[model samples]
Target: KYRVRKNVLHLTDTEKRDFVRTVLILKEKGIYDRYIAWHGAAGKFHTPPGSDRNAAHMSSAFLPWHREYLLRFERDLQSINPEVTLPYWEWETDAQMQDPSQSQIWSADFMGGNGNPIKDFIVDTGPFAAGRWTTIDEQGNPSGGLKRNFGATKEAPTLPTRDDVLNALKITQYDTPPWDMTSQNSFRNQLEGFINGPQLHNRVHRWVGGQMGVVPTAPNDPVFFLHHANVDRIWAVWQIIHRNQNYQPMKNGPFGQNFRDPMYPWNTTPEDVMNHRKLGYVYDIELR
Candidate 1:
């Protein structure tokens, strides 16, 4: 029942201090504004379908979008603190049943894509109990990434039944006008239907829209576990009401084709979605 403490793959002393320093410098006179613009697009996406009268911009896609985004941030950080590195938060545990909205996981930034050699240690050491941060070595890398240990993820919490499948793919009322929560007039109705409808599980899978993006899951890819951790935590809170509506993610497509369009920012294939090991990273107990 300990969401925060349970997921404790923490940043080391050096990492924590550097992270704070990074924040402090970012908040300093002329530097802070430039720093906040870094890496904040981890969960952003472009226009929804059916908008602009069915027009698609060529600038869409998860891979290149995030690559440029993260790189821009990295370059700025290096210019400010050459010895510092961008860090990551990895989720190796499942502590949803014990949930806290904010917990801190420690991971320092290192240059790891594939076959990248890591050295002994790198990162600062101070000002923890505030935020987790880290410094780097001459190689411009932090040695270790924190990995927390927790429970297993739920068995397809979003798995849909046969009825759920039909409900998910059968687009009776879709393909119309606005679908997001932005539409104030219809948002309540949309959310009500979205929350109270019968067929749930299978819908979740479809909603992922079958595309991976800017952030990578870790030990391998960190985002996957962290993303789903929030998903699981939602269920934990939802269960308190014991409402008839269970957790349902969009699994199938309204159109039986791959909605993974624009073709960029994708680090995973359809096959990659199946294994957390293929995409690792324990979530920060603090975050999800």
Candidate 2:
């Protein structure tokens, strides 16, 4: 599949240099696991009732988390490769997509099957990316109100709605959190794959997350782009094998026409998802 970069706005050269440098530094840390953790933790904003935060899954934070995620990466990348801005991929551009569950032939396949017992494949045992983090409403938890972040509160943080998260992902659905994050193996955390194995990734439930910078006067959260940038990074790395596979996002591929949260406003259009081939800009950082 081809990709394109939105040129609606651009960064200055000095801005570019700074972003690249920052990316190089981030990559140097090699803390992809922790990056993935924060990415996952961002999702805690949408945990549902009757479901254990640690057990069930949510995606309300997907959009904001990734938007800031990408920005964070770009900030670091600017520290080095000041020539590239975060790239966007129009997964549904092909307009020929017929199935939603198609597997990869050239990339690492991410199938949708709840493989909870399947968490015995990976081997992630580090601190940040390790299994030390918790997302439950236990003692000393972070606050999650829509406006107030009672840092010392045992309550959960206020994340966007399921529709909002999907809107950020530009997924086909914004009504529900797109199936269960753990109903299948696709529902995973950063450490899940490393700890258990590739067979079953049970880490966290952030399906599509990364930083892309802020969304203008929208959700003043800086965490958006940092989350999506990494989200883009994850998919980019997966392309190593995914290249063998293909995802030509066609018109009917998957998008939301029925589910609209309205809370998460966007100027994004169907053309946005279909324009990946149009904006395939290269970044300085490549996965190790």
Candidate 3:
């Protein structure tokens, strides 16, 4: 039942409708509530969980952790609707656009646009906008409405490009020491937004702002998966080009321990998820 994920923009109008309908169904089923609650849990809610910290944002585990997370989420959606394979947002296209906020992806019909000024960054348009949506904040407090201020802070005005991806993919190794935000010359660091120019993953979160900017609660926004799907796809390409080089997980220490070590709750390890083909899903486009 594994299926390839198509680009959100590339999906036909009918496919788009089906995809959205399925997601709304998932939301109504309280699946979204459970997903958000898992993040707010005190420890690795799902075993081999990402970390004792719940969400592993700025670490060596970022790529594989998120890849596995998305896979599970997609599986849940499929359980509800067999046709509901995830579609990714190729943010590069939006980055190339003069202004990504204008893209149809943000319309009420799609992911929705920014919030109204009087609404405390509460999104006034789109499917999951105010009144219709509810989420758990970073503090694990329950709240209503989806909040997004696209391009509001001028943080990530444009998206990262394929050329940027090529350079990141060219990184010879998987990650480096001090793998938090300061690591350099590491592909994982570059993609995770630690590197100055190749900050694709982090920039998207920053660009989305509001809840999307919050590390633990970022998934509160349905778009997080699509954003990360593209990130995971980049890792897929990185693996293809650097097949000889392996992702470095330290033999010990908090940073290195998660590397190759069994991720809690799940039976898989980072090593187990390096190949997406083995994971039951693939992307439509090939990275150069």
TM-score of each candidate structure, all chains considered together: 0.30, 0.30, 0.88
Off by over 4 Å in 3: 41-55, 253-256, 264-267
Stretches > 4 Å off in candidate 2: 1-178, 187-223, 244-264, 267-277, 286-288
Better of 1 and 3 by TM-score: 3
lDDT of 3 by residue, 201-227 (tens): 888888888788777788888888889
Q: How many clashing residue pairs appear in each of the predictions shown?
A: 44, 113, 11
Task: Pick out the ten consecutive residues of candidate 3 with the lowest summed lDDT.
Answer: 46-55
- lDDT digits (tens) for residues 191-263 of candidate 1: 2223343113222222221111112212112222333333333222333334343211122321111233221
Cα lDDT for residue 243, candidate 2: 49
> How does model 2 score by TM-score?
0.30
- Please give the lDDT score for candidate 1: 0.28
RMSD for each model, in Å, please? 16.4, 15.9, 3.4
Error of 1 at 104 (Å): 3.7
Give the alpha-carbon lDDT of every model. 0.28, 0.28, 0.74
Model 2 residue 263 lDDT score = 13
